[PDB]
């Protein structure tokens, strides 16, 4: 379903600066949070 | 060529998208927060627009 | 995880430094600031996540 998840994929062709799919969610959580509430 | 999409840090498409995937390194100072050096800073400070 | 030459990001005075180029008017301040923190708004943010952790 996401290409990025297939043993013949490189993560770094969809994901810049060394983020991984766990690391880019959290990054938009946090951007989410942040920008909004606290 | 830099693709705009993969500059934020994120490209749905990955191999397949039309413009290039330059690697790039994160400022972490921006990354948490704020950075001083700004626009003279090494790292990159992606826009999350 | 932020640190300013050895020293916590958040634990940084802002007040103390000798150019503050995001005090412009006009500057581009999503250049230092992220989450579309301010000058205070960053230091409430750090005063906030002290009282915490
Ligand atoms: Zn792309
Ligand atoms: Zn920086």
């Known amino acids: 379903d996401k290409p990025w998840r297939k043993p013949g994929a490189d993560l770094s062709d969809y994901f810049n600066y060394g983020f991984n799919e766990d690391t880019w969610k959290a990054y938009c959580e946090k951007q989410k949070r942040i920008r909004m509430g606290l | ?49």
């Open chain 2, 1 to 49: 060529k830099d693709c705009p999409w993969y500059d934020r840090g994120f490209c749905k498409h990955g191999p397949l998208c039309r413009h290039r995937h330059t690697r790039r390194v994160i400022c972490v100072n921006y990354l948490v927060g704020f950075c001083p050096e700004g626009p003279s800073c090494k790292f990159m400070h992606p826009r999350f627009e």
